[PDB]
Short mmCIF file of C-alpha atoms and ligand atoms in Angstrom, two decimals:
data_model
loop_
_atom_site.label_atom_id
_atom_site.label_comp_id
_atom_site.label_asym_id
_atom_site.label_seq_id
_atom_site.Cartn_x
_atom_site.Cartn_y
_atom_site.Cartn_z
CA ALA D 1 15.36 4.57 -20.49
CA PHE D 2 12.10 2.84 -19.08
CA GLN D 3 12.16 -1.44 -20.04
CA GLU D 4 9.02 -1.46 -21.08
CA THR D 5 8.07 -5.09 -22.26
CA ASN D 6 5.75 -7.06 -23.50
CA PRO D 7 2.73 -7.52 -21.13
CA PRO D 8 2.12 -11.19 -19.37
CA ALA D 9 0.55 -13.96 -21.66
CA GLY D 10 -3.04 -13.71 -20.31
CA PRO D 11 -5.65 -13.94 -19.08
CA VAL D 12 -4.23 -11.14 -16.73
CA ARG D 13 -5.79 -10.58 -12.95
CA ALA D 14 -4.32 -7.36 -10.93
CA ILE D 15 -4.23 -8.60 -6.98
CA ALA D 16 -6.00 -6.77 -3.90
CA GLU D 17 -4.14 -5.52 -0.91
CA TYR D 18 -6.78 -7.93 1.13
CA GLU D 19 -5.90 -11.13 -1.07
CA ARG D 20 -3.05 -13.41 0.61
CA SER D 21 0.42 -11.66 1.05
CA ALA D 22 3.87 -13.45 1.80
CA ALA D 23 5.65 -10.50 2.93
CA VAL D 24 5.20 -6.46 3.20
CA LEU D 25 8.39 -4.44 2.25
CA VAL D 26 10.08 -1.45 3.61
CA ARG D 27 13.67 0.50 3.05
CA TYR D 28 16.22 2.15 5.87
CA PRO D 29 16.96 4.94 6.32
CA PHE D 30 13.37 4.63 7.86
CA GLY D 31 10.46 6.58 7.66
CA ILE D 32 8.38 4.11 9.98
CA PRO D 33 8.57 3.22 13.81
CA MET D 34 10.25 0.39 14.97
CA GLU D 35 7.15 -0.62 16.73
CA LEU D 36 5.40 -1.28 13.72
CA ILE D 37 7.97 -3.53 11.92
CA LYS D 38 8.02 -5.45 15.15
CA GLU D 39 4.44 -5.82 15.18
CA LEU D 40 4.93 -6.57 11.18
CA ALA D 41 7.48 -9.35 11.58
CA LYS D 42 5.48 -11.03 14.54
CA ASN D 43 3.28 -12.79 12.11
CA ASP D 44 4.78 -11.44 8.25
CA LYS D 45 7.58 -11.15 6.66
CA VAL D 46 9.51 -8.43 6.37
CA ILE D 47 11.94 -7.67 3.53
CA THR D 48 13.65 -4.71 3.97
CA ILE D 49 15.68 -2.67 1.52
CA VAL D 50 19.26 -1.43 1.72
CA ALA D 51 21.54 0.10 0.23
CA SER D 52 24.67 -2.21 1.19
CA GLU D 53 25.98 -5.23 3.45
CA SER D 54 27.28 -2.68 5.92
CA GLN D 55 23.43 -0.81 6.15
CA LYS D 56 22.21 -4.46 6.80
CA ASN D 57 24.37 -5.25 9.25
CA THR D 58 23.06 -1.75 11.44
CA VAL D 59 19.73 -2.50 10.73
CA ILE D 60 19.67 -5.82 11.68
CA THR D 61 21.84 -4.22 15.03
CA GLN D 62 18.58 -1.57 15.25
CA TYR D 63 16.20 -4.47 14.84
CA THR D 64 17.64 -6.46 17.57
CA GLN D 65 17.77 -3.57 20.14
CA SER D 66 13.66 -3.30 19.31
CA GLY D 67 12.80 -7.12 19.94
CA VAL D 68 11.94 -7.53 16.37
CA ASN D 69 11.94 -10.94 14.83
CA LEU D 70 14.25 -12.12 13.00
CA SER D 71 13.18 -14.87 11.22
CA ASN D 72 10.84 -13.23 9.74
CA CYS D 73 12.86 -10.26 8.59
CA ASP D 74 15.24 -10.52 4.55
CA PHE D 75 16.65 -8.31 2.36
CA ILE D 76 17.12 -7.25 -0.59
CA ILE D 77 20.36 -5.02 -1.18
CA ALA D 78 19.72 -1.84 -3.77
CA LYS D 79 20.00 2.18 -3.83
CA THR D 80 17.17 3.61 -3.02
CA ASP D 81 16.20 7.18 -2.92
CA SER D 82 13.62 7.29 0.09
CA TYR D 83 11.07 5.32 2.17
CA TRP D 84 7.80 5.35 -0.45
CA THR D 85 7.63 1.94 -0.85
CA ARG D 86 4.62 1.84 -1.90
CA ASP D 87 5.04 4.08 -4.76
CA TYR D 88 8.03 2.85 -6.77
CA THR D 89 8.08 -0.98 -5.45
CA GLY D 90 6.23 -2.90 -8.29
CA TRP D 91 2.39 -3.91 -8.68
CA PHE D 92 1.25 -7.60 -8.34
CA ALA D 93 -1.00 -9.71 -10.94
CA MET D 94 -1.98 -13.25 -11.94
CA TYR D 95 -1.47 -14.48 -15.24
CA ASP D 96 -1.03 -17.28 -17.54
CA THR D 97 -4.15 -19.46 -15.38
CA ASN D 98 -1.19 -19.79 -12.60
CA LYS D 99 1.67 -17.54 -12.38
CA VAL D 100 1.96 -14.24 -10.38
CA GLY D 101 4.23 -11.92 -11.69
CA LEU D 102 5.22 -8.10 -11.05
CA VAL D 103 4.45 -5.28 -12.99
CA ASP D 104 7.12 -2.12 -13.34
CA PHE D 105 6.21 1.35 -14.36
CA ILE D 106 7.38 4.48 -14.49
CA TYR D 107 7.75 6.37 -11.34
CA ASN D 108 5.70 9.48 -11.37
CA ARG D 109 9.43 11.32 -9.70
CA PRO D 110 12.75 11.68 -10.51
CA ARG D 111 13.72 9.52 -8.15
CA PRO D 112 15.69 7.32 -10.35
CA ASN D 113 16.74 4.35 -7.72
CA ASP D 114 13.56 4.34 -7.18
CA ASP D 115 12.56 3.33 -10.24
CA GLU D 116 14.73 1.10 -10.29
CA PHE D 117 14.07 -0.69 -7.55
CA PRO D 118 11.25 -3.17 -9.03
CA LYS D 119 13.86 -5.68 -11.20
CA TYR D 120 15.26 -6.64 -7.47
CA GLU D 121 12.11 -7.37 -6.19
CA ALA D 122 11.18 -10.01 -8.96
CA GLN D 123 14.82 -11.18 -9.09
CA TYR D 124 14.31 -11.32 -5.07
CA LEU D 125 11.17 -13.21 -5.75
CA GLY D 126 12.04 -15.72 -8.74
CA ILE D 127 9.10 -14.20 -10.34
CA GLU D 128 8.39 -12.63 -13.58
CA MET D 129 8.39 -8.86 -14.65
CA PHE D 130 6.35 -6.87 -17.16
CA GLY D 131 7.58 -3.05 -18.04
CA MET D 132 3.91 -1.52 -18.40
CA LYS D 133 5.06 2.30 -20.10
CA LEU D 134 3.18 4.84 -17.89
CA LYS D 135 3.76 7.07 -15.11
CA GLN D 136 2.53 5.85 -11.59
CA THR D 137 2.55 6.00 -8.28
CA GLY D 138 1.42 2.87 -6.05
CA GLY D 139 0.11 5.09 -3.78
CA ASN D 140 -2.70 6.52 -6.43
CA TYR D 141 -3.79 2.88 -7.19
CA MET D 142 -5.96 0.47 -5.55
CA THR D 143 -7.61 -2.78 -7.33
CA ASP D 144 -10.93 -4.53 -6.25
CA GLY D 145 -9.00 -7.98 -7.45
CA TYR D 146 -12.08 -8.56 -9.76
CA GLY D 147 -10.90 -6.42 -12.83
CA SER D 148 -11.17 -2.42 -11.17
CA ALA D 149 -9.16 -0.03 -10.07
CA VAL D 150 -9.25 3.68 -8.91
CA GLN D 151 -6.50 6.25 -9.66
CA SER D 152 -7.01 10.06 -9.24
CA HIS D 153 -7.13 11.97 -12.59
CA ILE D 154 -3.18 12.06 -12.51
CA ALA D 155 -2.78 8.69 -14.45
CA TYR D 156 -4.36 11.06 -16.81
CA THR D 157 -2.72 13.82 -16.40
CA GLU D 158 0.94 12.45 -16.01
CA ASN D 159 0.56 10.67 -19.45
CA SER D 160 -1.00 13.32 -21.28
CA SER D 161 0.62 12.14 -24.82
CA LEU D 162 -1.86 8.83 -24.68
CA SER D 163 -4.94 9.45 -25.05
CA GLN D 164 -7.80 7.99 -22.42
CA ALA D 165 -8.18 4.83 -24.00
CA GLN D 166 -4.65 3.93 -24.70
CA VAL D 167 -3.73 4.28 -21.04
CA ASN D 168 -7.05 2.13 -20.46
CA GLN D 169 -5.67 -0.27 -22.89
CA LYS D 170 -2.35 -0.41 -20.71
CA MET D 171 -4.36 -0.98 -17.21
CA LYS D 172 -6.25 -3.94 -19.35
CA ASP D 173 -2.77 -5.44 -20.48
CA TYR D 174 -0.97 -5.34 -17.97
CA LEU D 175 -2.81 -5.82 -15.36
CA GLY D 176 -6.26 -7.09 -16.57
CA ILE D 177 -8.02 -3.92 -15.42
CA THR D 178 -11.68 -3.84 -17.21
CA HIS D 179 -12.94 -0.78 -15.62
CA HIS D 180 -9.62 2.18 -14.79
CA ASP D 181 -12.19 4.04 -13.03
CA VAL D 182 -9.81 7.38 -13.20
CA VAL D 183 -11.36 10.30 -10.93
CA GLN D 184 -10.58 13.73 -10.15
CA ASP D 185 -8.95 14.04 -6.92
CA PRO D 186 -11.43 15.23 -3.87
CA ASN D 187 -8.92 16.06 -1.13
CA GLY D 188 -7.52 19.85 -2.58
CA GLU D 189 -3.79 18.75 -2.26
CA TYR D 190 -0.79 18.10 -3.77
CA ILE D 191 -0.62 15.00 -3.73
CA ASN D 192 -3.32 13.79 -5.62
CA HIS D 193 -3.17 9.89 -4.22
CA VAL D 194 -6.52 7.94 -4.04
CA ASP D 195 -5.51 6.74 -0.37
CA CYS D 196 -5.30 9.80 1.17
CA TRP D 197 -8.93 9.80 0.92
CA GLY D 198 -9.95 6.04 -0.51
CA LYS D 199 -10.19 2.34 0.14
CA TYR D 200 -10.96 -1.06 -1.01
CA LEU D 201 -11.34 -2.79 1.76
CA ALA D 202 -13.25 -5.64 0.32
CA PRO D 203 -14.34 -6.27 -3.03
CA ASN D 204 -17.90 -5.30 -2.55
CA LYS D 205 -16.47 -2.19 0.60
CA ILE D 206 -14.92 1.43 -0.13
CA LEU D 207 -13.70 2.60 2.65
CA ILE D 208 -14.09 7.28 2.17
CA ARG D 209 -12.52 9.91 4.13
CA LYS D 210 -15.25 12.22 5.47
CA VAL D 211 -14.37 15.94 6.65
CA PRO D 212 -16.82 18.52 8.86
CA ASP D 213 -19.46 20.43 6.83
CA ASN D 214 -17.90 23.79 6.48
CA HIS D 215 -14.12 21.67 5.52
CA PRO D 216 -13.62 22.81 1.92
CA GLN D 217 -13.60 19.31 0.87
CA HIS D 218 -16.81 18.35 2.52
CA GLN D 219 -18.93 18.56 -0.53
CA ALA D 220 -16.65 16.60 -3.21
CA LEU D 221 -15.85 13.73 -0.60
CA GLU D 222 -19.71 13.30 0.13
CA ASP D 223 -19.95 13.22 -3.46
CA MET D 224 -17.75 10.60 -3.77
CA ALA D 225 -18.93 8.52 -1.42
CA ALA D 226 -22.28 9.04 -3.03
CA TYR D 227 -20.91 7.81 -6.32
CA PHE D 228 -19.78 3.99 -4.98
CA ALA D 229 -22.71 3.54 -3.01
CA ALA D 230 -24.77 4.29 -5.97
CA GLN D 231 -23.27 1.45 -7.81
CA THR D 232 -23.03 -2.04 -8.46
CA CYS D 233 -19.42 -3.78 -7.25
CA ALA D 234 -18.07 -7.00 -8.29
CA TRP D 235 -19.96 -9.56 -6.03
CA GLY D 236 -23.45 -7.59 -7.64
CA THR D 237 -24.75 -5.67 -4.99
CA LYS D 238 -23.80 -1.98 -4.62
CA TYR D 239 -21.02 -0.57 -2.55
CA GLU D 240 -21.18 -0.99 1.44
CA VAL D 241 -19.44 2.74 1.63
CA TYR D 242 -17.79 3.16 5.03
CA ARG D 243 -16.64 6.54 6.74
CA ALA D 244 -13.53 7.67 8.35
CA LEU D 245 -14.35 11.10 10.14
CA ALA D 246 -10.21 12.95 9.84
CA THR D 247 -11.87 16.33 12.20
CA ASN D 248 -7.94 17.35 11.37
CA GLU D 249 -6.66 15.89 8.39
CA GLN D 250 -5.63 12.94 10.25
CA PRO D 251 -4.70 9.84 7.94
CA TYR D 252 -7.52 7.47 8.88
CA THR D 253 -7.59 5.80 5.26
CA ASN D 254 -4.07 5.26 4.91
CA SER D 255 -4.00 1.94 6.30
CA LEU D 256 -2.00 -1.64 5.62
CA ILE D 257 -4.12 -4.57 5.03
CA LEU D 258 -1.64 -7.13 5.70
CA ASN D 259 -3.69 -10.82 5.46
CA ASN D 260 -5.65 -10.81 8.39
CA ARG D 261 -4.34 -7.60 10.25
CA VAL D 262 -5.33 -3.95 8.57
CA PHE D 263 -2.75 -1.12 10.37
CA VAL D 264 -4.20 2.31 10.56
CA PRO D 265 -1.96 5.28 11.53
CA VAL D 266 -2.77 7.20 14.67
CA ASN D 267 -2.18 10.76 15.42
CA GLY D 268 -5.12 11.95 17.82
CA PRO D 269 -6.97 12.88 19.61
CA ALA D 270 -7.56 8.91 21.41
CA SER D 271 -11.79 8.97 21.02
CA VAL D 272 -11.32 10.09 17.23
CA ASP D 273 -8.80 7.52 16.68
CA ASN D 274 -10.86 5.05 18.22
CA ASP D 275 -13.92 6.04 15.89
CA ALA D 276 -12.01 5.12 13.55
CA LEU D 277 -10.60 2.44 14.20
CA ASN D 278 -14.14 1.00 15.37
CA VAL D 279 -15.05 2.30 11.74
CA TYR D 280 -12.29 -0.35 9.97
CA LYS D 281 -13.11 -3.32 12.77
CA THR D 282 -17.06 -2.97 11.69
CA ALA D 283 -16.24 -2.82 7.93
CA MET D 284 -13.84 -5.79 8.40
CA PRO D 285 -15.40 -8.52 10.96
CA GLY D 286 -12.95 -10.95 12.12
CA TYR D 287 -9.60 -8.92 10.80
CA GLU D 288 -7.38 -7.52 13.52
CA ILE D 289 -7.45 -3.58 13.57
CA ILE D 290 -3.90 -2.28 14.77
CA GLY D 291 -3.63 1.52 15.56
CA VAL D 292 0.12 2.30 14.77
CA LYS D 293 1.59 5.25 16.40
CA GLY D 294 3.74 7.64 14.20
CA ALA D 295 7.66 7.68 14.67
CA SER D 296 8.58 11.09 16.40
CA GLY D 297 11.37 11.64 13.58
CA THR D 298 9.06 11.26 10.68
CA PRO D 299 5.55 11.21 11.77
CA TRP D 300 2.50 10.84 9.85
CA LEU D 301 0.98 13.24 7.48
CA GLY D 302 -2.64 13.79 6.05
CA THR D 303 -0.70 13.49 2.37
CA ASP D 304 1.88 10.36 3.98
CA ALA D 305 1.09 7.57 6.22
CA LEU D 306 1.67 3.88 7.23
CA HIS D 307 0.50 2.74 3.45
CA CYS D 308 2.57 5.30 1.48
CA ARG D 309 5.54 4.02 3.37
CA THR D 310 4.83 -0.08 2.76
CA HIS D 311 4.23 -1.91 0.35
CA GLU D 312 2.34 -6.10 0.52
CA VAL D 313 3.79 -8.34 -1.48
CA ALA D 314 1.44 -11.48 -3.37
CA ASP D 315 2.66 -14.58 -2.46
CA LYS D 316 4.61 -16.50 -5.55
CA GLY D 317 2.49 -19.53 -5.03
CA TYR D 318 -0.46 -17.87 -4.41
CA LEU D 319 -3.42 -20.46 -3.62
CA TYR D 320 -6.42 -18.26 -5.65
CA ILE D 321 -10.04 -18.79 -4.82
CA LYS D 322 -12.19 -17.03 -7.47
CA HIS D 323 -15.47 -17.14 -6.30
CA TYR D 324 -18.95 -14.65 -6.72
CA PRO D 325 -21.03 -14.96 -3.93
CA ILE D 326 -24.83 -15.99 -3.84
CA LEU D 327 -26.28 -12.80 -1.54
CA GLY D 328 -29.53 -11.69 -0.52
CA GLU D 329 -32.67 -13.04 -1.57
CA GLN D 330 -32.51 -15.49 -3.97
CA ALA D 331 -35.35 -16.67 -6.44
CA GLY D 332 -33.90 -20.03 -6.88
CA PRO D 333 -35.10 -23.10 -7.35
CA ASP D 334 -31.24 -24.15 -7.61
CA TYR D 335 -28.80 -22.45 -5.02
CA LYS D 336 -25.26 -23.53 -6.88
CA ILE D 337 -22.13 -21.52 -5.89
CA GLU D 338 -18.86 -22.03 -8.10
CA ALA D 339 -15.53 -21.39 -7.12
CA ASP D 340 -12.34 -21.72 -9.44
CA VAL D 341 -9.28 -22.88 -7.03
CA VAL D 342 -5.74 -22.60 -8.89
CA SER D 343 -2.48 -23.15 -7.12
CA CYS D 344 -0.09 -20.85 -8.52
CA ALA D 345 2.59 -23.78 -6.24
CA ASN D 346 1.90 -26.15 -8.46
CA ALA D 347 -0.03 -28.62 -6.03
CA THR D 348 -2.14 -30.66 -5.82
CA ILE D 349 -5.61 -29.54 -4.11
CA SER D 350 -7.19 -30.81 -1.58
CA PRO D 351 -10.12 -30.35 0.15
CA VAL D 352 -12.28 -27.70 -1.30
CA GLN D 353 -14.93 -27.46 0.88
CA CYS D 354 -18.20 -24.81 1.33
CA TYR D 355 -18.89 -24.67 5.46
CA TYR D 356 -22.39 -23.60 5.85
CA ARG D 357 -25.16 -23.62 8.57
CA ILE D 358 -29.24 -23.51 7.60
CA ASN D 359 -31.13 -21.19 10.11
CA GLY D 360 -28.53 -20.12 12.69
CA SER D 361 -28.62 -24.01 13.25
CA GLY D 362 -25.69 -25.38 14.97
CA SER D 363 -22.39 -24.87 14.17
CA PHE D 364 -20.91 -24.25 10.41
CA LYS D 365 -20.62 -28.16 9.12
CA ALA D 366 -18.15 -29.41 5.88
CA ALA D 367 -19.04 -30.22 2.47
CA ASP D 368 -16.81 -31.32 -0.18
CA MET D 369 -17.24 -29.49 -3.43
CA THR D 370 -17.69 -31.55 -6.70
CA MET D 371 -14.61 -30.82 -9.27
CA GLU D 372 -16.68 -30.52 -12.17
CA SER D 373 -13.68 -29.59 -14.43
CA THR D 374 -9.61 -28.44 -13.13
CA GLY D 375 -9.89 -26.02 -11.16
CA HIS D 376 -13.75 -25.71 -11.17
CA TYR D 377 -15.88 -26.44 -7.89
CA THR D 378 -18.89 -26.11 -7.80
CA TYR D 379 -21.33 -27.10 -4.64
CA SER D 380 -25.60 -27.13 -4.88
CA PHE D 381 -28.06 -26.52 -1.74
CA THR D 382 -30.54 -28.86 -1.29
CA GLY D 383 -33.90 -29.39 0.64
CA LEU D 384 -33.89 -25.64 1.06
CA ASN D 385 -37.14 -24.27 2.10
CA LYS D 386 -38.87 -20.53 1.57
CA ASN D 387 -37.49 -18.23 3.82
CA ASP D 388 -34.65 -20.42 4.74
CA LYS D 389 -31.06 -18.37 5.76
CA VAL D 390 -27.72 -19.52 3.86
CA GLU D 391 -24.49 -19.05 5.78
CA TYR D 392 -21.65 -20.43 3.72
CA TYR D 393 -18.22 -19.99 3.10
CA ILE D 394 -15.53 -21.48 0.94
CA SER D 395 -11.92 -23.20 1.77
CA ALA D 396 -9.25 -25.19 -0.05
CA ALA D 397 -5.62 -26.05 1.17
CA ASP D 398 -3.06 -28.04 -1.17
CA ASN D 399 -0.10 -29.96 -0.65
CA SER D 400 2.53 -26.95 -0.07
CA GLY D 401 1.11 -26.29 2.93
CA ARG D 402 -1.42 -23.30 1.65
CA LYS D 403 -5.23 -23.06 2.99
CA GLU D 404 -7.27 -20.02 1.79
CA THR D 405 -10.58 -19.10 2.66
CA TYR D 406 -13.33 -17.13 0.40
CA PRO D 407 -13.75 -14.57 1.96
CA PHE D 408 -10.75 -13.91 3.05
CA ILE D 409 -11.17 -14.19 6.78
CA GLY D 410 -13.49 -16.72 6.39
CA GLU D 411 -15.95 -17.86 8.99
CA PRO D 412 -16.01 -14.50 10.85
CA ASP D 413 -17.35 -13.17 7.72
CA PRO D 414 -19.33 -15.38 6.34
CA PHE D 415 -21.82 -14.76 2.61
CA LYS D 416 -25.90 -15.04 3.18
CA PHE D 417 -28.32 -15.56 1.76
CA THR D 418 -31.81 -16.30 1.77
CA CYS D 419 -34.38 -18.74 0.21
CA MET D 420 -37.55 -17.29 -1.94
CA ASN D 421 -38.49 -20.43 -3.92
CA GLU D 422 -41.08 -22.26 -2.94
N1 LIG L 1 3.17 8.71 -1.10
C1 LIG L 1 3.64 9.48 -0.32
O1 LIG L 1 3.70 9.96 0.71
C2 LIG L 1 4.34 10.32 -0.94
C3 LIG L 1 4.64 11.70 -0.92
C4 LIG L 1 6.11 12.31 -0.82
N2 LIG L 1 6.37 13.10 -0.41
C5 LIG L 1 6.28 12.07 -2.43
O2 LIG L 1 4.90 13.32 -2.46
O3 LIG L 1 6.47 11.86 -3.49
N1 LIG L 2 9.07 15.84 -0.12
C1 LIG L 2 7.82 15.26 0.21
C2 LIG L 2 6.90 16.15 0.43
C3 LIG L 2 6.01 16.91 -0.42
O1 LIG L 2 6.55 16.79 -1.72
O2 LIG L 2 4.94 18.07 -0.27
C4 LIG L 2 7.52 14.21 -0.87
O3 LIG L 2 7.91 14.44 -1.60
CL1 CL L 3 4.38 13.80 -21.33
NA1 NA L 4 9.96 2.01 -12.02
#
């Protein structure tokens, strides 16, 4: 039976895919090209699931043949049914102020070895695991990191003995989801996973598939894009909605955000791939976008591509910056920013800075933020005149060697506001 547990001690907050990742999880026998594993292992830790010591040795030889950086490769020995690590591996959440935990669930497939796998993931990472008794799949889940999550309708229809209030309450208790947005899938295919048509790229940005006017799903996808563009996001502005045109069922929304890199599956034509990559680059300033060709033996599909066959792994020692930015026209008369910073590594934080620029003058300048109370840092912009333009971002570091900015990418994409008070 599924191992349901109590939920984590609160407050709880699900970690978004665009927050720091300490690794990426993949599985052998493989469903991804070796070129992707090589690109991943250049800068990130790759954890490969294998069934035995013998399969570990087989994978090390294949990685060596392909020129993969073995110093960034680790293994978990566990039986698995499939390579869809997106769908059956555990979900990450912060809880109890400064801890990172794993959330297990009932995988919505008759794949009992995949379903059992999250306990091995939590044991490898040395983190606690909580069992949320819902039939779920990670491909059908995404969070903004501020309490919202989007899922297709199967989150309710595959949990039909529970009311929507009961399903919503489990997402609140185990993942800190205060808005569980369960929508009718707009894609007209069997899988009903959000990652085949939608992807948060930041707390204020969402990518939505677009198809030609006469495609049968055209209006459902336009309605979905208009729904996000019409509502407020976690940063108080309306969502920025970006569109990836699939002229022929290319899975352009099925990308992986891993730290400052974005891996986008491409399967042509080349000009249409370039257009899709340039949407990601436009939406995500400062990120490095990589178009990834599929493996010939396990190609990318419209309903199953790169995001489906990977899962980011959160940092157990995450240096977490919580910030609601000051954006756009600001009435004033005060312009005060606040950021909460917590070290899940239990390391002393020093320094916490605001990097800023006024009216585009010179370079960004750092100012130390004031620690008002443990983990709560503030900064007031002084001497600002009407119509002054401010660019800023947050930086923090701790004694474990971690360094983080808010927004994630830092200086390439600062927050901006205009002073309106005289
Ligand atoms: N995430 C996926 O692409 C899963 C595909 C797989 N064939 C399934 O339906 O389970
Ligand atoms: N069997 C594949 C594809 C499908 O179900 O259509 C998965 O699972
Ligand atoms: Cl049921
Ligand atoms: Na499970």
